[PDB]
Amino acid sequence: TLESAVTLDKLEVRDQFYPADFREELQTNLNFFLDGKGVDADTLVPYDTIWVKDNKAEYAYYTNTTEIALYLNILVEAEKAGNQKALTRIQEVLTTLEEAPKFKGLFYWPYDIKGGELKPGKGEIAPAVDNGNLAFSLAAVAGAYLNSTDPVKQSIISRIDQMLKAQIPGWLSLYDKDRGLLWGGWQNGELIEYHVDRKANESRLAALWAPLITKHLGAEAIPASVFNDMETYTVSYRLDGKNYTPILTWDGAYFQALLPAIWLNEKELVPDYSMFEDTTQLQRIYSKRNNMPMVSSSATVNDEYRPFGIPHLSEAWVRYDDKIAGGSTGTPHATALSYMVDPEGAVKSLKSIKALYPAIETSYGWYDAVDSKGRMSTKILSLDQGMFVGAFLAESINADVERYLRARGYWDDVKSMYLSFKDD
């Protein structure tokens, strides 16, 4: 029970993930997750938000399980680079998670971290989105050690299977038999009003996962339908004599289209990924023009926080004439996300950005928001840093997920469900 407390004061992945073009800059952003920078010493989870003025940091004492998933997968990659401290940390982190209060097995959003333990936020909110995300994270973590005869790694495996098994009540809880979709979650003891009803958003992993972990329960098996029946909408544009048909995220925000791609090889599993390629190029053009990064939910330049999307890449605007987010600001993590679609142009772009704005670099990472005029946030966010770094690791995290799904009999289910991912 009494153990030494390791300090991760160095964090490095394998060499293959660092572009020749861009090594240092990835390390800088990766360094966010060093102990004492972006990671809390007492709970050993990343802070939700930092403020950095001159390599001195202020901290918002919150976290969520999406930030923790990404942290985990990164740790795995540091472990593969040969960091033995990371393997200890992965076990400390699983303990935390096992200790975190839950609701029918599902994690809360957010977790308050003020005490030195995870308290559920005042809402008592239990979202499908965060539990979907973390389900795949743990798959990838298990995916990475399933071949190990090391008994410590075997241990991690069994602990992850347990923790996912425990979520069965939660997932069953969330299955509306009438609408045939997942409710969005639980909030203060009550089902949340809305449903997981669009493939083109973050919450799709939950819908993907529920059928899998409940596959065996026979009569009460949650149907694939919870994923398949979800709607997918594009819009058909033309530009300088070329057609684009971009997949529309609800609020136009990049992250909803490409976050899941950190865990799943969506570029192969989707029949025609062209829509994603198109959403990407349109984002890439709007970015280049406004001399700022691509656009997703992020910090503001004055340290608020706001969804940000391109109106013409937004379902709500295009489809329902309801504009719910601006394209005033860009964020580095959205440009880095795009390395999962086009890695050459992503590095060019981020490099282009740092040439224009040399002050964007801090020792905790690049700042989260950059205006078209060149104004900038003081905030750096664990969510965005995890997405930034994870984009570059996705090939390795994707392979591990697939290994997991193959071992658990899930892989054909996933592929089948992906057959449905096509423009309605």
Nearest to 246 by CA among 271, 270, 281: 281
PDB resolution in Å: 2.4
Are the C-beta atoms of 297 and 255 separated by less than 8 Å? yes
- Give whole-number Cα distances, 145 to 14, 140, 151, 249, 395, in Å: 16, 9, 10, 34, 16
Query: What is d(CA 142, CA 154) in angstroms, rounded to the nearest whole number?
Result: 9
Sign of torsion over alpha carbons 127, 77, 44, 102: positive
Are the C-beta atoms of 417 and 227 separated by less than 8 Å? yes
> Which helix (DSSP H) or strand (DSSP E) does residue 139 occupy?
helix 128-143
Give the end-to-end CA distance of the chain in Å, rounded to a whole number: 55
Rg of the chain in Å (alpha carbons): 20
Are the C-beta atoms of 128 and 184 separated by less than 8 Å? yes
Using the 8-state DSSP alphabet, how is residue 190 labeled?
E
Are the C-beta atoms of 214 and 221 separated by less than 8 Å? yes
Query: What is d(CA 152, CA 349) in angstroms, rounded to the nearest whole number?
Result: 41
Phi then psi for 57, rounded to 5 degrees? -120, 135
All domains of the chain, ordered by start, with CATH?
A: 15-419 (1.50.10.140)
Query: What is d(CA 286, CA 292) in angstroms, rounded to the nearest whole number?
Result: 9
Burial of 84 (0-12, 13-18, 19+ CB in 10 A): exposed
Within the chain, how many helices (H) and strands (E) appear? 16, 18
* CA 394-397-399 angle, 5° bins: 105
Q: How far from the centroid of its chain's Cα atoms is residue 236's Cα?
A: 28
The three-state secondary structure class of 322 is coil
Query: What is d(CA 305, CA 379) in angstroms, rounded to the nearest whole number?
Result: 9
- Give whole-number Cα distances, 377 to 86, 301, 337, 349, 421, in Å: 31, 4, 19, 19, 36
Burial of 189 (0-12, 13-18, 19+ CB in 10 A): exposed
Strand 365-366 to 361-362 pairing: antiparallel
Query: What is d(CA 300, CA 329) in angstroms, rounded to the nearest whole number?
Result: 7
Query: What is d(CA 229, CA 227) in angstroms, rounded to the nearest whole number?
Result: 6
Residue in this structure with the two tokens 């770094």, named with its chain if needed: 389
- Give whole-number Cα distances, 194 to 109, 171, 231, in Å: 17, 15, 14
Structure tokens at 264: 């799943």
Q: Give the total residue count for the chain.
A: 424
Nearest to 229 by CA among 257, 202, 198: 198
Burial of 375 (0-12, 13-18, 19+ CB in 10 A): middle
Are the C-beta atoms of 310 and 327 separated by less than 8 Å? yes
Query: What is d(CA 236, CA 246) in angstroms, rounded to the nearest whole number?
Result: 7
Sign of torsion over alpha carbons 353, 55, 41, 91: positive
> Which helix (DSSP H) or strand (DSSP E) does residue 78 occupy?
helix 65-80
Query: What is d(CA 23, CA 186) in angstroms, rounded to the nearest whole number?
Result: 42
Query: What is d(CA 221, CA 171) in angstroms, rounded to the nearest whole number?
Result: 10
Cis bond leading into 110, ω under 30°? Answer: yes
